[PDB]
């Protein structure tokens, strides 16, 4: 089945066309005058030339002016002193926003296997403010299989040929397609060809008709998840920071650079729900494969994964990309890394935020090993110390590893206490775990394929530098973090517990906080919507300025 949506008055409101009407009233012009001038000449008039791509919007403005003068002349009325078609359309175009419920329905239909398309009468926009529209189309168009624009195909609704062209690109028969439009005249040829047609006035009634005919719930459905990433559709970047070390990243959006740093044992892909949201919010997102992971290099030496070297390489990464600063947002081990970036390279850090991981200053009077002992839930970290032991258990069955790890707070385990005595992470774990509700089998297989390259040696080495990190961290014991900073705690992270962050204000006076209840350790995919809301509010506040 197929579903086809118009843009103006359907996926975007208010219909620019509906501004003519409101404008007429405001200026106290005769009803319909502006709409009349707009369509004047029908098939051979200025506006049809515009919609077929014969001329640009800026060439059209003067033509529209002329039609307005002729219409006012005929109607025996005068147009206002500073009457300006340029200004009127600027405002109408800018006012138009995405109709979220209609978009949501479109996403549901595609998710359930429909091929979807936007078919729109539109123009080539060369106005100085054309970027606003450019941004609208971009956001919408990514959610659809096809976008057919009159000005690119040289055809316009309601000409019968464009409907045949639609069916051809849909590779579907008319009876297999639903077509939604707010303009009855433009529906007729669709109906004539035999497709199901919906006349959109109010969105809710339209979606009622739409769910009735497709047999799929579209109205009053549960809150959808944020948009995710298809790895194959992303821009992949590669930067050599040292002769044998290259960092891979995925990049999306424009605006202030935002560098996302994942935890153990994860991937750039762990940010899949924030990447599109942050980009759409006006940021240039750079989601790293951290050293040891995925398409980034994974040298064997333990020392290659100490915080001092990892931080230095992140600075080099910025240097090579030509960035003086980025905002750094980290989760888990990535969260610890970003605190040290703030502490040692404040000049390069526009702002810093950590999910789950608190900033804990080094204790100069206690070995890090001792500190780890003094906390039952930290037992698995000692298990990780001896090279080879954990690698073997984690690498044995990768699908099992990730299905056991990536689980919501209710779906547990694992129980990271008494792991050493038990003799392993999964010693009490099923061979074939159920799939957690947070992930799909396909998402799990992505992580599986990523870890086939380098395995767990690199990732585990992040844990094998306790003494070295402690020494380096001690150098910072006189400092405070005084750049913009955000700490997000997760109620149900049973290792990185919210109370671990209780004293951070001592080191970070102006610290801002967020808190997510009913949220386990895997914050980004556990509660993506709330994560996105927290980060975006904080970015627009403390980074973007």
Ligand X SMILES: CS(=O)(=O)c1ccc([C@@H](CCNC(=O)c2ccc(C#N)cc2)c2ccc(F)cc2)cc1
Stretch that binds a second copy, among 167-175, 264-272, 313-321, 330-338 (CB under 8 A): 313-321
Phi and psi at 292, nearest 5°, equal 105, -10
Q: Which residues is 5 bridged to in the sheet?
A: 118, 180
Do the beta carbons of residue 268 and residue 287 sit within 8 Å?
yes
Our finding on whether 257 is near a second copy (CB under 8 A) is yes
Stretch that binds a second copy, among 19-27, 230-238, 381-389, 440-448 (CB under 8 A): 230-238
Count of other CB atoms within 10 angstroms of residue 204: 11
Helices (H), 119-159: 131-141, 150-153
Stretch that binds ligand X, among 101-109, 126-134, 239-247, 257-265 (CB under 6 A): 257-265
Our finding on whether 439 is near a second copy (CB under 8 A) is no
Helices (H), 429-492: 441-451, 457-461, 466-474
Active site residue 345: no
Range 385-422 burial, b when 16+ CB lie within 10 A, else e: eeeeebbebbeeebebbbbbbbbbbeeeeeebbebeee
> If we measure between CA atoms, which residue out of 397, 391, 355 comes closest to residue 491?
355
182 annotated as a binding-site residue:
yes
Our finding on whether 344 is near a second copy (CB under 8 A) is yes
Residue 333 interacts, among ligand X, a second copy, none and using kind-specific CB cut-offs from 5 to 8 Å, with ligand X
Instruction: Say which of 163, 248, 463, 526 is annotated catalytic.
Output: 463
Give the Å distances, CA to CA, from 14 to 18, 19, 202.
7, 8, 11
Instruction: Give the whole-angstrom CA distance, residue 149 versus residue 15.
Output: 16
Residue 264 interacts, among a second copy, ligand X, none and using kind-specific CB cut-offs from 5 to 8 Å, with ligand X
Our finding on whether 49 is near a second copy (CB under 8 A) is yes
518 annotated as a binding-site residue:
no
Beta carbon nearer to a second copy, 34 or 311: 311
In whole angstroms, how close is the CB of 174 to a second copy at the nearest point? 27
380 annotated as a binding-site residue:
yes
Residue numbers 469-528 binding ligand X by CB under 6 A: 493-495, 520-521
Instruction: Say which of 36, 125, 289, 332 is annotated catalytic.
Output: 332
Our finding on whether 425 is near ligand X (CB under 6 A) is yes
Query: Which of residues 149, 332, 443, 526 is near ligand X by CB under 6 A?
Result: 332
Active site residue 521: yes
Q: Which residues is 499 bridged to in the sheet?
A: none
Number of residues that bind a second copy (CB under 8 A): 56
Residue 41 interacts, among a second copy, ligand X, none and using kind-specific CB cut-offs from 5 to 8 Å, with none
Cα angle 163-164-168, degrees, rounded to a multiple of 5: 115
Do the beta carbons of residue 117 and residue 147 sit within 8 Å?
yes
Residue numbers 97-156 binding a second copy by CB under 8 A: 124-126, 130-131, 133-135, 137-138, 141-142, 152, 154
Instruction: Give the whole-angstrom CA distance, residue 3 versus residue 349.
Output: 46
Query: Which of residues 319, 370, 432, 518 is near a second copy by CB under 8 A?
Result: 319
Q: Is residue 334 packed enough to be buried (19+ CB in 10 Å), middle (13-18) or exposed (0-12)?
A: buried
Instruction: Give the whole-angstrom CA distance, residue 87 versus residue 84.
Output: 5
Residue 410 interacts, among a second copy, ligand X, none and using kind-specific CB cut-offs from 5 to 8 Å, with none
Residue 521 interacts, among a second copy, ligand X, none and using kind-specific CB cut-offs from 5 to 8 Å, with ligand X
Do the beta carbons of residue 309 and residue 290 sit within 8 Å?
no
Our finding on whether 83 is near ligand X (CB under 6 A) is no
- Beta strands 97-98 and 12-13, pairing class: antiparallel
- Beta strands 284-288 and 245-252, pairing class: antiparallel
Instruction: Give the whole-angstrom CA distance, residue 127 versus residue 444.
Output: 46
Half-sphere exposure of 423 (CA within 13 A, CB side): 2
Residue 416 interacts, among a second copy, ligand X, none and using kind-specific CB cut-offs from 5 to 8 Å, with ligand X
Q: Give the DSSP letter of residue 8.
A: B
Our finding on whether 159 is near a second copy (CB under 8 A) is no
Our finding on whether 466 is near ligand X (CB under 6 A) is no
Query: Which of residues 140, 170, 307, 336 is near ligand X by CB under 6 A?
Result: 336
Beta carbon nearer to ligand X, 174 or 520: 520
- The token pair at 167 is 């069916």
6 annotated as a binding-site residue:
yes
Residue numbers 352-411 binding ligand X by CB under 6 A: 357, 380, 405
Cis amide linkage into residue 152, ω under 30° from 0: no
Residue 237 interacts, among ligand X, a second copy, none and using kind-specific CB cut-offs from 5 to 8 Å, with a second copy
Number of residues that bind ligand X (CB under 6 A): 16
Query: Which of residues 70, 320, 373, 418 is near a second copy by CB under 8 A?
Result: 320
Instruction: Give the whole-angstrom CA distance, residue 499 versus residue 478.
Output: 24
Do the beta carbons of residue 504 and residue 513 sit within 8 Å?
no
Active site residue 269: no
Our finding on whether 506 is near a second copy (CB under 8 A) is no
List residues near ligand X by CB under 6 A: 263-265, 332-333, 336, 357, 380, 405, 416, 425, 493-495, 520-521
Which residues are the active-site residues?
Answer: 332, 463, 521
The binding site for phosphate comprises: 120-121
List residues near a second copy by CB under 8 A: 49, 53-56, 58-59, 124-126, 130-131, 133-135, 137-138, 141-142, 152, 154, 232-240, 251-254, 257, 279, 284, 319-325, 344, 346-348, 350, 475, 478-483
């Amino acid at each position: 089945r197929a579903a086809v949506f118009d843009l103006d008055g359907v996926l975007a409101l208010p219909a620019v066309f509906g501004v003519l009407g409101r404008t007429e009233e405001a200026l106290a012009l005769p009803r319909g005058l502006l709409n009349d001038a707009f369509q004047k000449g029908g098939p051979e008039g200025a506006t049809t030339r515009l919609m077929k791509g014969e001329i640009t919007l800026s060439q059209w403005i003067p033509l529209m002016e002329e039609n307005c003068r002729k219409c006012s002349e005929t109607a025996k009325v005068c147009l206002p002193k500073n009457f300006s078609i340029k200004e009127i359309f600027d405002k109408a175009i800018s006012a138009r926003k995405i109709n979220r419920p209609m978009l949501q329905a479109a996403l549901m239909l595609r998710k359930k296997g429909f091929t979807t398309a936007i078919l729109t009468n539109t123009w080539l926009d060369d106005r100085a403010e054309r970027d606003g529209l450019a941004q609208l189309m971009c956001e919408l168009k990514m959610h659809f299989d096809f976008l057919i624009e009159s000005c690119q195909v040289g055809m316009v609704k309601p000409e019968p040929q464009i409907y045949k062209f639609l069916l051809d690109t849909l590779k579907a028969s008319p009876s297999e397609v639903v077509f939604l439009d707010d303009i009855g005249a433009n529906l007729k040829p669709a109906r004539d060809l035999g497709m199901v047609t919906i006349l959109v006035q109010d969105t809710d009634t339209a979606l009622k008709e739409l769910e009735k005919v497709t047999g799929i719930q579209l109205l009053n459905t549960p809150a959808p998840l944020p948009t995710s990433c298809n790895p194959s559709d992303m821009s992949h970047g590669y930067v050599t920071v040292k002769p044998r070390v290259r960092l891979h990243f995925v990049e999306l959006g424009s605006g202030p650079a935002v560098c996302l740093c994942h935890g153990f044992p994860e991937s750039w892909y762990s940010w899949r729900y924030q990447i599109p949201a942050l980009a759409q919010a006006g940021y240039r997102v750079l989601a790293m494969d951290m050293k040891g992971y995925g398409e980034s290099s994974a040298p064997p030496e333990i020392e290659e994964y100490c915080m001092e070297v990892l931080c230095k390489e992140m600075v080099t990464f910025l240097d090579k990309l030509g960035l003086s600063q980025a905002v750094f947002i980290g989760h888990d081990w990535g969260g610890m890394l970003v605190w040290y970036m703030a502490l040692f390279y404040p000049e390069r850090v526009r702002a810093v935020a950590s999910l789950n991981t608190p900033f804990i200053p080094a204790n100069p009077n206690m070995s890090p090993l001792e500190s780890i002992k003094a906390n039952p839930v930290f037992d698995y970290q000692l298990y990780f110390q001896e090279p080879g032991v954990a690698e073997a258990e984690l690498e044995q069955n990768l699908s099992r590893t990730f299905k056991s790890l990536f689980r919501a707070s209710d779906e547990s385990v694992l129980s990271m206490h008494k792991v050493c005595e038990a003799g392993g992470l999964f010693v009490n774990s099923p061979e074939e775990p159920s799939l957690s509700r947070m992930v799909t089998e396909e998402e799990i297989q992505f992580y599986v394929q990523q870890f086939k390259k380098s395995g767990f040696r690199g990732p585990l080495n992040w844990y094998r530098n306790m003494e070295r990190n402690w020494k380096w961290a001690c150098k910072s014991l006189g400092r405070k973090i005084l750049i913009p900073a955000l700490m997000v705690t997760a109620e149900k992270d049973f290792v990185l517990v919210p109370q671990m962050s209780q004293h951070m204000e001592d080191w970070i006076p102006h610290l801002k906080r967020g808190h997510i209840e009913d949220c386990g350790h895997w914050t980004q995919m556990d509660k993506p919507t709330e994560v996105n809301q927290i980060l975006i509010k904080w970015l627009d506040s403390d980074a973007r300025n």
